[PDB]
């Protein structure tokens, strides 16, 4: 008898697609052909700061625009000073797989987590001169994948057992719980106005929730592999994602349609990270081909290439003001570009 329910679901999907198709009323190529392209660019590496003795997996800037955190493979955090290239802290850990890192916008909290199924919070600023753990957040049985602070007292996690949830730091137990994500979540990012966030999927799916209640308002589709990186345009009405099969797609919330597609012929590698600049005129991406190149948003043409590393590139970040680019590969070096 469930066949009738499946058939009515299919016909509802067909009606939704028919309603969606008509409203697409702009091919951006024919309207943006008039505007001139950007010129060629070449930048120089300025600082090569060392200190890790393993494979780096993550990094994250701070609002101070002079501090960034890093997590290695054997368990270690180092907080760097980008102007002078001196480390201000060095925290050991109790686990040997740390794949995520977050820094607090206020400036006195750092969070971690990984394959050990526990998220821990560190209190940098203490009355005494030492550093000590504050809380641990257990409860989910998968491996942790990502952590972002909504605020000093609210944290959102990304589990591996098809779960996303929030927590209350003082109590230590969950406040709200999300579900309905069939695949595996591996990335998510927050809107500038701290009201919405989207999550990636293993089976090429995009979801958009609301923090207050937790209703899935739209859904996006179109890739054929895992979505590894999700970013936002500064205005807040478009998010660009990447995938393993050398495709980068920009979607529009109001359109619900794939606007453009940035593909080139001589690439067979996977994307690991993407990021927009301040204005949003350029788009950067990383490859497992040991290199990295800078793209353009409007005309889908490559502006230039960057001198890569001796191994795979696994992270990328751009400062809020836009005067710095930092890249970290698997050979234990960080690069500063300008």
């Amino acid at each position: 008898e469930l066949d009738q329910l499946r058939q009515e679901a299919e016909q509802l999907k067909n009606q939704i697609r028919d309603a969606r198709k008509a409203c697409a009323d702009a091919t951006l190529s024919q309207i943006t052909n008039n505007i001139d392209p950007v010129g060629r660019i070449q930048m120089r590496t300025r600082r090569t700061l060392r200190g890790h003795l393993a494979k780096i997996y993550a990094m994250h800037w701070g609002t101070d625009s002079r501090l960034l955190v890093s997590a290695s493979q054997d368990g270690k955090l180092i907080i760097w000073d980008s102007y002078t290239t001196n480390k201000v802290h060095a925290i050991p850990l109790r686990s040997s797989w740390v794949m995520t890192c977050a820094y607090a916008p206020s400036g006195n909290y750092v969070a971690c987590g990984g394959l050990d199924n526990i998220c821990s919070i560190y209190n940098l600023k203490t009355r005494e001169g030492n550093v000590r753990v504050s809380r641990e957040l257990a409860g989910h049985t998968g491996y942790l994948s990502c952590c972002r602070f909504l605020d000093d007292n609210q944290i959102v996690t990304s589990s591996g057992d098809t779960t996303c949830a929030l927590w209350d730091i003082e109590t230590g137990q969950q406040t709200t719980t999300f579900t309905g994500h069939t695949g595996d979540v591996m990335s998510l990012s927050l809107a500038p106005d701290t009201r919405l966030f989207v999550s990636g999927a293993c089976d090429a799916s995009a979801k958009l929730w609301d923090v207050r209640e937790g209703m899935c308002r739209q859904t996006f589709t179109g890739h054929e592999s895992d979505i590894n990186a999700i970013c936002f345009f500064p205005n807040g009405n478009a998010f660009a994602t990447g995938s393993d099969d050398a495709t980068c797609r920009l979607f529009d919330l109001r359109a619900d349609q794939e606007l453009m597609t940035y593909s080139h012929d001589n690439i067979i590698c996977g994307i690991t990270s993407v990021s927009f600049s301040k204005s949003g005129r350029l788009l950067l991406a990383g490859y497992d081909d040991f290199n990295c190149n800078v793209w353009d948003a409007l005309k889908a043409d490559r502006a230039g290439v960057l001198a890569g590393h001796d191994n795979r590139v696994s992270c990328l970040g751009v400062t809020d003001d836009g005067m710095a680019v930092a890249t970290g590969s698997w050979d234990s070096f960080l690069k500063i570009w300008n």
Binding site: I16, A26, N237, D256, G322
Partner: protein, 56 residues
Amino acid sequence: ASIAQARKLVEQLKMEANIDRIKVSKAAADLMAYCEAHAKEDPLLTPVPASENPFR
């Protein structure tokens, strides 16, 4: 089981159905205007003297 599943189905998908669907050309024009207006905030595209960048 699958009954619960179909329940979830009718529940959300019909929530997806009643959403507003607007023009795309206006969104593209707004994006272009936003990109053009903030051209003064991109040190990468607009070069600055050596005294400006501290990372040197």
